[PDB]
């Protein structure tokens, strides 16, 4: 079984395109995040959301924050809305796609 | 509605002992409530206590000694580093060792005087003096 430098398990199918890190000619290098999908309307792209807490200092309380990014969605792991995904960083793929989906966790619920 | 069974207890205690009573009943009884009674006892603020079961979450009988000035809950439950205690002891207590400040450290519930001996921190839940 092939690894790419993440110590995780590959997908159970084979792809076509060359913009896939598992089966093609793409290289991943950088940050490694984790979120849940909020749309996949256009072709081969998703939108992933993650949440964190900001700590104000004058009032000493917390505050909820978000971050929405866009990721390439190779045809061997095509992710729908409402499921956890691991995403990695690589070169610019379009005007606003700079990440790629590598593994899907918890499909349905 | 009901949101905090620990605050109700501590306000009940400081309201009762201010008019001269010698026994109270802490009705909804967690085990956090019992754990804080345990450390209010070792420092000599209350007498002896027992857990009575009534079919619905149980009650607590506690006898007072008339030995406390004020008790209450530190509500928002701020966290503290193991070297930043005096900043809070100067805000709640009246002199440089007057009374205890109860801390919910990762090894149970204890007063800040025993947290500084191990050098740990946690959430502040209450204070008695």
């Amino acid at each position: 079984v092939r690894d790419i430098g993440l110590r995780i398990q590959p997908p159970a199918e084979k792809c076509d395109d060359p913009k896939c890190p598992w089966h093609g000619h793409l290289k991943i290098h950088g940050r490694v995040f984790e979120g849940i999908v909020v749309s996949d309307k256009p072709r081969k792209t998703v939108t992933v959301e993650r949440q964190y807490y900001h700590y104000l200092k004058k009032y000493e309380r917390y505050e909820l924050r978000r971050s929405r990014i866009h990721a390439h969605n190779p045809p061997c792991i095509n992710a729908k809305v409402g499921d956890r995904v691991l995403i990695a960083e690589t070169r610019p793929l379009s005007k606003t796609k700079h990440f790629v989906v590598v593994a899907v966790l918890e499909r349905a619920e | 509605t009901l949101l905090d069974p620990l605050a109700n207890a501590l306000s009940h205690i400081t309201n009762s002992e201010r008019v001269g009573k010698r026994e109270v009943y802490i009705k909804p009884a967690s085990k956090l409530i019992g754990e804080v009674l345990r450390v209010m006892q070792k420092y000599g603020y209350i007498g002896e206590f027992e857990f009575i079961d009534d079919g619905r979450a149980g009650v607590y009988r506690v006898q007072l000694l008339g030995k406390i000035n004020k008790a209450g809950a530190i509500k928002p439950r701020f966290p503290v580093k193991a070297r930043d205690y005096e900043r809070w002891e100067k805000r709640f207590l009246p002199a440089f060792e007057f009374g205890i400040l109860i801390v919910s450290t990762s090894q149970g519930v204890m007063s800040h005087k025993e947290a500084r001996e191990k050098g740990i921190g946690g959430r502040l839940i209450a204070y008695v003096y």
Binding site: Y53, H54, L56, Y59, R61, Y62, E63, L64 | K75, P76, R77
Partner: protein, 146 residues
């Protein structure tokens, strides 16, 4: 009234918003952030200014008082405005003549406004023809240009 509104642990955003919302019911802050003093101020954020006097006048004092305070009309140079300025001292008005250049400061009252029984005046004369007025009033120096 209850306790106080957002005393939660994860309610930082609403607490900051309530403060920023009610800070605008102030007057020292709204007036400092919107910059309302400039845009309506004949001197334009200066401590002093210079003008050329048009006519000499006399004002009546307040109610529990009596007497006439002497003043002049100054026509500024950086703007072109016309203000009313007060000549402090015993016999000073006999040293101010028309077609003279005068220097102008504030009069130092509450909030920057006016002071005492001269209620509408808010500037005072300090220099005449590049020669201080305080001197001229008490001898000690002579007035150039006639």
């Amino acid at each position: 009234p209850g306790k106080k509104a957002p005393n939660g642990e994860f309610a930082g955003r609403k607490l900051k918003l309530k403060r920023k919302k009610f800070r605008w019911s102030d007057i020292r802050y709204k007036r400092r952030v919107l910059r309302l003093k400039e845009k309506s101020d004949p001197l334009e954020g200066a401590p002093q200014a210079r003008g050329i006097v048009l006519e000499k006048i006399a004002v009546e004092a307040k109610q529990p008082n009596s007497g006439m305070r002497k003043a002049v009309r100054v026509q500024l140079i950086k703007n072109g405005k016309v203000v009313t300025a007060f000549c402090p001292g015993d016999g000073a008005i006999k040293f101010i003549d028309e077609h003279d250049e005068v220097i102008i400061e504030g009069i130092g009252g509450p909030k920057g406004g006016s002071m005492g029984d001269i209620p509408g005046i808010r500037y005072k004369v300090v220099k005449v023809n590049r020669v201080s007025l305080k001197e001229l009033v008490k001898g000690r120096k002579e007035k150039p240009r006639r």
